[PDB]
């Protein structure tokens, strides 16, 4: 009458309660899937005994012995009555057992060690304006100086080219150069140049605050492409997991290339359990990159230390599905339970509570590190100037 | 009063500045931060070596890791260049070198008084010394950045006074060169 | 060896009538995502398929009194059609009576709105912080200050030509070749300066206010709000599972929205998604359509491109092939679906049908467009100055 | 067995449902107090027939005939079994009937017609700085000019007093006056003055954006004091309401004075029903001011047209209380019902739904109205200047 | 004609021991709100009252096993005391067994926290936007630029004395008596100008960032958060209705907080409100006390004044006199209470005991304090300049 | 060319400006807003009288209520002073008066050429006229403020061109006075 439930110990889908040694029975384990399975036996109308698969595995078929390991093995091999787990749906597992309508969705995704907040770079003070604007600004400054020179030559009342350049430059920085135009055309050119500066500077200074302090995480990987295009950083998977099989069977260029990479890399990229891969990322100092189902990546990102991040959109879309032995009479009811729950809204609530309710993760004075670059420029120009003078002097003494 | 006293003031200032800068380089009380060395605990730190205090070790003057601080990323990211320069401390020592050479040119000016460009070269040396020292400060701070209390010890302000003196000396030496040229007229 | 009947519905892009369909016959009359999809499915299962539209153009639902099945589900259950390949949302009631298949596309219940005013920042967006009236009256005051200063000074280098200059430098803060020595000239200068300071500070502060604040507002932007609003209309499609979900919902917001929908006059419902689309387009912000998310996105993409999805999806479910209860075809269809998924197909078709077309394709650095009017102005002033210098050259030479 | 419930038609405490003519029985009325009374009969275990007091009154005792009107009259005079209303608790009503623990709290408060958003005043450009700062700024500007004058006289290398004033003024407005200091003390004074300006102006311009557009509602009344200190604007009450009796019996200066005012004012300030007073405020154009219980004021403020506002803190604190005839056996249970509900949290939920769920109530370019004042100043100074010159000229021609 | 026993509890300011109480005996031993209150009540009812503290110093609650009454309620129910005049929160359980009275003060369940760092803006708050290091290195760069410009210019009016000037005007944007004519001088000027622009724009933008952004943050700031946090401790007082409310709550957040409180080691509870107060004061932000609101406010007012109320009150209830069930004293007491309320008494006493003492008493215009350091600086520079001019006068005269 | 043509240009400009300003005062197409008069409906409006269009009334030129626009508050609030000035329209008419008097003084200058201060007074008149007109505009707008589309009709820009001309004339008259003084020398 009782039903031998299979499952796995994979947080946040299954977790033993704090002080579980002080507990015996289905109360030992708590988790999303525990809640689900309790509800399912409520709806279907039987009794369940929870069991963690002894192999600590999800499911996969030996390429030589053609045996099914883990929970799929238990179900096909009678050890188990049912599975209620983060079990993924795939063709191969259809051909031997009957799954249910996905009770939640997912993708195969990339987990990385959170790169540090890359302090705003030197030469950050250009960020508030795009690079085509500075180029246009410069063409315009040249153009103005040129036009004021031509005008002062052809139609005078002195603005050599260098002095014109100086006046324009001084007007951009709001410092009034000592020489001013005296004609009606140079005065026009100066007026429009002045308006130009007023606008440009007003805008730039309007948004200059954040840009010099903005801190942005840029990752060395942004997709599967940036993974398959490098081997400095590895990328592995769980073992006996649908992720492995999907990569193996993939007929696409990127996934096949990465499969080749990972079937021979040394030391082995693969692992035996999720948390092991989590640790490998959390210690490999960004030289590793884990390929797991999206939900784990999300929970791990929200959970402390919050030292990992999901990167790149889900390479594929899939779904987690309750399972049953082929020809079981438990397939039809578990299905309707999933549907009823999803319609009522239980699954969304659980997804929010187990993930979001687990969540554990200003205007600041400028630091010299922020505005250091300009200082360098300053000194640079000074050096240059010194040098220049010496040149001139050395030239004159000659 | 600028009747030859200017030169003696110049040279004593130059050698005092060189002394301050050599001390600052060769000293470890540039900082008074708290670090995870003392078994976290108070640390007066320096350009070359940390050396704990008010801690368990209380006197263990350790050499610092500038580039090998668990690099973990950003090799050849323009942070490496900064960390190189901080560790090498090429700019402060450049300032010291230039102050020394400026005093040399000053003294040789007292000797081969026939040539005037010597003192001018001395002035340029002192000026470049100052610029280099401020860059030294800037790199030091922009590295030390990588939010606890911190503070700057007498060695930092010795570098500061060194820069002040270096600029002053550049002024005085240039003034000497100008008087010398006017005398040449 | 008989062709299998394939009922479906006309909803772009899942199925559509080919351009020149009058010139076409048979299964080549229609084009759409589900068209190709059924193509591959029948290729896999090795049967021939005959396309047919559903008479009513309505998906499926049950009369509460007659307890009959309409639309595609009516066609299948009563045996008129052999297979349904269309967005046939899976739900508890439908699944009781027919055999669904593992989904091939995921979605949810979502809000569609008419696009409000773009209010896009043009190229003369650097004037917006100060109304047209202020710019006018600034010019007026410039002329006033300059003429007055000429006057009080001349009954000094304060002609009119230099006064307009002095009062143009002061406004731009770019200096003064001359400063008044008289009490009157000084009073006027000291007033223009103050006027200037206030106006410029105002302009710059409000400029920062604009640049750091762009359109980030939408009224409904959720489900609670929608259920709270009353100046707006919102409903569903008859003969579909969206209406069923709203009607059967045991939630607060959903229950209230069902109350509203079930009693609003005129009938907020429609008969075709196209009808609700054209309603919202011609609702003047007075109709907000609750439908799926796939169609919301597709509609937003295609021209007019005058709609937008809003808010997060209320729920999450999926489409699915369907077959009569107990049929012998379901197995191969499910396996085919999974094969398609693992192989990257469904992604391919979705990209082809939604984004490939593309009828319409904190701080961020300024685009040259935002501030290009300045460059237009500057160029105009340059050309004008060269022109005026030509004039002056002629006037002087003669 | 059924219980004759008394109550009143006072929104949002009691309201007939839309299309009530199509309804008969307790379903005709909906409201907060309706929900409460339904619950109360649920807990106590009897049946209730709702009844609106025929007099349309709350309760009050004739000073000559010593009869009790309204709901209190019905309860004392057997007409009514119980009252569940916005009935206020007071001594006089204790002496004849038994109240329950207050199911919600309140105060006597002032309702006003929403005064318009007083556009920021002329001379708004001083708001970003306090008035002691401008006074200190001016003392400082004078001090600087003085000190630079003394220094240039006693220790020179010309800065008369007026020229010093000019230089200082020019430096405050960032416009470089043509004359600059040449000594080491005047240069110091100028440097510190320059730093002074940089800081002051930076701050002022930092916050100048909002202040010139800020729109603030200032009311001609801010308390009972500002009511008793004027008779331009009236202040009245409901009739046969505890507010009236509380004012009448008040031994405090303010309340006694206002009671005297209102017992003789013509036309009569008092009214016969709340909504009538609401209308009187909403039409009296701020010449009237209603004194009612706080909750009504709140709901009316949230409800559209949202053309009224609560002003001044509650002159007193009181509470609404279910009532019963003296010696009734219904007193003890209704009490415990109130307590149980308040402990569970029903009353807070109702208070939120009936009030907050009824709720029906940016960076903007500058309008000339905002910055008009400075223009006037400009022209003013110009006029002045003109005049001044004429004076000088008239003096010189003499 | 017997004095009536008056049990109560020692909780400032409701009841307290007078300074020099050892020099006092009888009812004049204690002072507090409830002291005066009982004074007026017994005055009204015309009886004599004898004050007594409750032995346990704990308000009241019921043992679940022995089903006994402790504290003031124990004293009353078992007959040790004749009346209770103290904050004796009304609730369902207590009211079953004794006769309460209409409240005399209202309150709710609220959070108390240790005050975090004030971070108050001092008088040199105009430097905060730029770190101490930046100001230092700005001075260094000023000295560098000036010395270099002297140099390149002199091997021209660019002595050192005028170079430091030119490079001081440029930084403040207040002009330039001189502009370089050399290539080297111009390179340096054009670099200082740029440096200047970046630094000043930065300073001003971040200044706006400070002034328009003051402390507006607190972590818990609600009840949901509190129930979500785990680095913090929070509990109740034993032998009171706050613990009862949390324990008996049927709400989500309250239920979870009860779970936390019932299992946290060490016992988050305390025995006296003073104990929890001293705990939070000595909790280093690690204890957050849930108690009433009256005491929260009073504690915040009195020195140390190192606490603060946070969040809105979870519920809303009231104090109340109490008497043994069935007593004949309740009626007069209730009438007295209402008389006190209508007469403005309770307000008077509350003002006397809470605010009269006062141990510690968007945009807003700047206070002179925020920016007074500028005036200190300016004055210092003035005096220094007069001093230096005295020096120069002496040096020149000799 | 400034050999007496300046005066004729002055006077024709003065009288043209006076004409434009008189038209603007005496005209009702200053605005093209939408108002709740037309039975809400398009309205071209003016300094003195609204007069609907593209509406039911379509031609009913109504006199406006400036101060009595449901005052409902703010008597003696500094808004009353503005509304007074807008309604009176004393500033535009002052501009017209001053332009007239300036033309008068110009013509009398052509007569009593012995006195030079006359033309100067004319210039001052024109200048004050301009200042007053800009104030007129400012009050008009800062009242009209008390958010639909709106627009300014040819009468507004006639006032604008009047101000332009008035300032121009102030310039020219002052130039005349200066030449006259130089001739007096
Ligand atoms: C007159 C213009 C002077 C320009 C001088 C600027 C020269 C050098 C300063 C930049 C050095 C900083 C480089 C570190 C970041 C990087 O790796 O590129
Ligand atoms: C040189 C300083 C010039 C100062 C001239 C300012 C004179 C008058 C302008 C203010 C008039 C505005 C008054 C309307 C508001 C009010 O009622 O006070
Ligand atoms: N549920 C997945 C897990 C695979 C993974 O985590 O990569 C499976 O059964 O294969
Ligand atoms: N796809 C929906 C129809 C569309 C709708 O109801 O919104 C269904 O199968 O029920
Ligand atoms: N409930 C109050 C209403 C009085 C008022 O609205 O002013 C009473 O019974 O008197
Ligand atoms: N006033 C509370 C005691 C204080 C508390 O429990 O927080 C009561 O009477 O129950």
Residue numbers in the entry:
A (entry chain B), D (entry chain D): 393 to 549, 570 to 773, 783 to 819
B (entry chain I), F (entry chain J): 15 to 53, 79 to 185, 196 to 234
C (entry chain A), E (entry chain C): 388 to 542, 565 to 770, 779 to 815
What does the literature reporting this entry say, word for word?
AMPA-type glutamate receptors (AMPARs) mediate rapid signal transmission at excitatory synapses in the brain. Glutamate binding to the LBD triggers clamshell closure, which transmits to the transmembrane domain (TMD) to open the channel’s gate, or leads to desensitization through rupture of one or both LBD dimers. TARPs are principal AMPAR auxiliary subunits, comprised of three groups; Type-1a (γ2, γ3) and Type-1b TARPs (γ4, γ8) are widely expressed, generally slowing gating kinetics, increasing agonist potency and reducing channel rectification by polyamines. Here, electron cryo-microscopy structures of the GluA1/2 TARP-γ8 complex, in both open and desensitized states (at 3.5 Å), reveal state-selective engagement of the LBDs by the large TARP-γ8 loop (‘β1’), elucidating how this TARP stabilizes specific gating states.
To trap the complex in the open conformation, we exposed the sample to a saturating concentration of L-glutamate (10 mM) together with cyclothiazide (CTZ; 100 μM) prior to vitrification; CTZ blocks desensitization by locking LBD dimers in an active conformation. Activation requires an intact interface between the upper (D1) lobes of an LBD dimer, and separation of the lower (D2) lobes upon clamshell closure transmits gate opening through the LBD-TMD gating linkers. The ‘upward’ pull of the D2 lobes on receptor activation causes an increase of the D2 inter-lobe distance from 17.3 Å in the resting state to 31.4 Å (between GluA1 S631 and GluA2 S635); this distance is comparable between resting and desensitized states (17.3 vs 15.0 Å). In the resting-to-open transition, upward motion of the D2 lobes for GluA1 and GluA2 (16.0° ± 0.5° and 17.0˚ ± 0.5˚, respectively), relative to the centre of rotation of an LBD dimer, is accompanied by a 2.2 Å vertical compression of the LBD layer towards the membrane. In resting and active states, the β1 loop adopted a ‘collapsed’ conformation, favouring engagement of the GluA1 and GluA2 D2 (lower) LBD lobes. β1 loop contacts with GluA1 D2 predominated in the active receptor, while interactions with both GluA1 and GluA2 D2 lobes, were evident in the resting state. Upon receptor activation the M1 and M3 linkers bundle up and splay towards both the β4 and Ex2 loops of γ8, bringing these loops into contact with Gln508 in the M1 linker. This transition may enable TARP control of the critical M3 gating linker and increase stability of the open state through tension on the M3 gating helices. On the other hand, the vestibule above the gate adopts two-fold symmetry, and rearrangements in this region precede opening of the gate; the force transmitted from LBD cleft closure unzips three sets of contacts between the M3 helices of a GluA1/2 dimer: (1) between GluA1 Met625 and GluA2 Val626; (2) between GluA1 Arg624, GluA2 Arg628 and GluA1 Ser781; and (3) contacts between GluA1 Leu620 and Thr621 and GluA2 Ala622.
